[PDB]
């Protein structure tokens, strides 16, 4: 498998996932200045900007590398926020809509 087409695919996939986050609540790191207790609960923060930096640093060399960090975005948000919040429901919606994006993108990776 060639590296360049794979990273092109991950870039497109990351763009499609970001499009599902219409409120852009996962676009940048959770601002630790506004939620000082966040690192009490969350062992590894994640967000789409960090994912883009990891992608371009060649830290994602298989689809699981990539999907694990996406899953962290979702799971961290479900963990930190109460069920009756916009943030929690946004993570549920992203899990649902993003899972479909990822399934198709992984099938294309497997054609490489």
Distance CA 100, CA 65 (A): 17
Neighbours of 50 (CB within 10 A): 15
To 10 degrees, the CA torsion angle through 22, 26, 28, 33? Answer: 120
Interaction mask 71-100, ligand BEA, x per CB under 6 A = ------x--xx-----x-------------
* Residue 44 token pair: 């590894």
- Residue 77 Cβ, how far from ligand BEA at the closest point, in Å? 4
What's the chain's length in residues?
112
Asked if residue 35 binds ligand BEA (CB under 6 A), the reply is yes
Q: With contacts defined by CB under 6 A, name the span among 9-17, 28-36, 49-57, 100-108 that binds ligand BEA.
A: 28-36
- Residue 106 Cβ, how far from ligand BEA at the closest point, in Å? 25
Residues that bind ligand BEA (CB under 6 A): 25, 30-31, 34-35, 77, 80-81, 87
């Amino acid at each position: 498998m060639q590296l360049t087409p794979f990273l092109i695919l991950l870039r497109k996939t990351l763009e499609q996932l970001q499009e599902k986050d219409t409120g852009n609540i996962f676009s940048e790191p959770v601002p630790l200045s506004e939620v000082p207790d966040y690192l009490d609960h969350i062992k590894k923060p994640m967000d789409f900007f960090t994912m883009k930096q990891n992608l371009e640093a060649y830290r994602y060399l298989n689809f699981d590398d990539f999907e694990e960090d996406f899953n962290l975005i979702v799971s961290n948000c479900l963990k930190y926020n109460a069920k009756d919040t916009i943030f929690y429901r946004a993570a549920v919606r992203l899990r649902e809509q993003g899972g479909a994006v990822l399934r198709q993108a992984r099938r294309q990776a497997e054609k490489m």
